[PDB]
Amino acid sequence: MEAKAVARTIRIAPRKVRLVLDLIRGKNAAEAIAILKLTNKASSPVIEKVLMSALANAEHNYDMNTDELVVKEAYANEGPTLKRFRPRAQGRASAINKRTSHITIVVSDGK
Amino acid sequence: AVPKRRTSKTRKNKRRTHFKISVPGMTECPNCGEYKLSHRVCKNCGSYNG
Amino acid sequence: YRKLGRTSDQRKAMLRDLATSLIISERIETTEARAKEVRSVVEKLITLGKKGDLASRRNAAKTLRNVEITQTALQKLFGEIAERYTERQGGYTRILKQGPRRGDGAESVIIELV
Amino acid sequence: KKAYKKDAKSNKYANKPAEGHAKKADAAPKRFIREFRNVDVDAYEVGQEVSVDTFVAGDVIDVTGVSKGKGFQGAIKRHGQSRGPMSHGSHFHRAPGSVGMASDASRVFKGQKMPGRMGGNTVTVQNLEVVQVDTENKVILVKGNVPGPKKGLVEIRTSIK
Amino acid sequence: VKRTYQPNKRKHSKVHGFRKRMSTKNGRKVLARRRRKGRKVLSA
RNA sequence: AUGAUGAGGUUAAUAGGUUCGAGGUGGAAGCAUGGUGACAUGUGGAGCUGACGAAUACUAAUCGAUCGAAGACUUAA
RNA sequence: CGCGAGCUGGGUUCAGAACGUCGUGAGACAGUUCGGUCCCUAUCCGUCGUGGGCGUAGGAAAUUUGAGAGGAGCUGUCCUU
RNA sequence: UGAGUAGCGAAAGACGGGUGAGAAUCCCGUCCACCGAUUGACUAAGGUUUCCAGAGGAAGGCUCGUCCGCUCUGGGUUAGU
RNA sequence: ACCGAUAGUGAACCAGUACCGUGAGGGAAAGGUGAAAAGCACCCCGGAAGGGGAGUGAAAUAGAACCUGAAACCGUGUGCU
């Protein structure tokens, strides 16, 4: 059927994550983990975690073969941003947005 | 200088047309059984054998 | 040859350090640029060690730190390292790309004596 | 070049179109095919070796080759512009000058000289002479120094003047 | 650069202290006014 | 600048090493001799040599993968 | 009186001080003289280079013609008639 | 939005062995480097627990972190001179 | 025929408090699960956080960042171009 895994308040910017998520969307689940292990980006490990949890939820709660599971969807959504401040010069000060993201992945057999 | 006019959310996405990152250019290891990255040592099990 | 993000004699120092570490350990995991450059430095000392004379020992001594193993590094070279590579005519090393590093993305290789 | 191959992954080997073209002439596949106008066509469609002996010493020549490359070379180096003063409190040293008039042009004109990639052009020199045509070593000695780096292809022909 | 506040316990209490406030009519007006407002910390 | 442009990818001289050169400096260390010593002469145009020229598969360009046609419609000859 | 988000800042009209002159005065020049912080990370058009997508009724490799565009275009002095 | 842009605050690091779910950065070692009328030892003002050990890795640290001047939990200051 | 959380007191919340200042003195933001904690036992991925089931419940997209949950804004998919 379909099995999802969501990771919430992952402390990475969401458009530093959609870079990687634009790769493994539509792919098989084997090459997906291959890519997510081989890539240089810092979003790969957390997305490795999430995609492996998606596959495990499939094979444990829904019992669909972990051989034909294709990543139907994968997307990041914004989250609660931590707003910080940085001392500029001459007494000024500039905001900083330590933003977060919610990483959802949905693997489905396609049947 | 400073921007004279705020950028639409069309021109933005057009400029981010090329903000991709390609895949690494990987292969499968004939020994390890899994995906390695070509011209590199196999992550999983050991050898290179080139 | 290629500047290594370092100043001149700082680069000289780094290369001497890596060649000593190599002939002490026989294999080291370094960055691909550093490995490319040390490949042409650690391999001109094995030549001097395959010569063996006094002048060769001193030309080697001026590019080789002091670390005892007990032996030295120079005794290690003109002693038991130079004898194993007695037949081959150059090409005494190799590089093996491990892959990208975390924190850098630096291309990490494993350099070693053949 | 070599003959056709199946690995053939470096251009050291001809490809099949190139070999059909060169086999039309019963001549081996070749790098640097170039056309010559202005010669009354009196050679053979069958490829016969054009030896350097076509040229005699006391003639005159023009030698076409690509210039030598120099990447992104800025205004002073590329267009022979002067530079600003260096010491009397000046902050203008090697940049271009102004790039137009004020508000009655309101834009930069085409042809404005600006920094960019330099060299690499197909330049031609003219009225060179041939000091010696060394046959049997197959070289020509020209009076001067021609465009291009070492090993740079150069096409020699007779002067248009 | 030398900034305006060079801390000193003795200076701070001898000028802005409690007893220096209570030793005056005006300082007592200040204490009364801060008790009226509800200040957690009356004096310095 | 990056990408691109070129030279190659073992059925291989692309780079590095090794061996010869060129050019550069200018007579290496060791020894012997002559001086009490600083030093001098021979051995010996010596020795060292980044980029330049050749040659040699000794190391590395492995094994792999991705993309990419089978050719629309009228009239005229 | 092209060009200071390309440069300078000498004069010009900032705060100091002084000369001649005028003003009872505070102070003003017809003046004159010495000293005196020149900010910016380029969004759009524009220009200079350099790539990718699709197109050009099959997929390519190579060689090209050239509509059009740009460059160059200066001059002296000696000898001979 | 500007934009994945400017910045990431003066300075030499290298390799090995670990610990680890994860190491350019944390620990140990060797080499190297820098100060040395001082980047060293001690004290007044000031701060007021930042001191130590065991545990941690949400937030802070201009990156990372298995670490810390951060968090949790227990401790630490002894005068007739 | 007064307000209903930007209102009403500066303060519906441990508020003259965080914080700011040498000082006199200035000064905020902060409400709502459910009828009842019945506040998620157990299993799986994970180092944890966080999830997916399984249960409580009338409802869990009421899971303590908890009544509804608008818009700016950020995305994924797709019909016409």
PDB file of C-alpha atoms (C1' of nucleotides) in Angstrom, chain E residues 7-10, chain H residues 45-48:
ATOM      1  CA  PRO E   7      33.081  49.365  38.749  1.00  0.00           C
ATOM      2  CA  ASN E   8      33.925  49.943  42.393  1.00  0.00           C
ATOM      3  CA  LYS E   9      31.975  48.463  45.297  1.00  0.00           C
ATOM      4  CA  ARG E  10      32.981  51.224  47.685  1.00  0.00           C
TER       5      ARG E  10
ATOM      6  C1'   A H  45      40.241  46.203  41.497  1.00  0.00           C
ATOM      7  C1'   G H  46      36.400  43.811  39.241  1.00  0.00           C
ATOM      8  C1'   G H  47      33.391  39.400  38.434  1.00  0.00           C
ATOM      9  C1'   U H  48      30.768  36.143  41.998  1.00  0.00           C
TER      10        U H  48
END
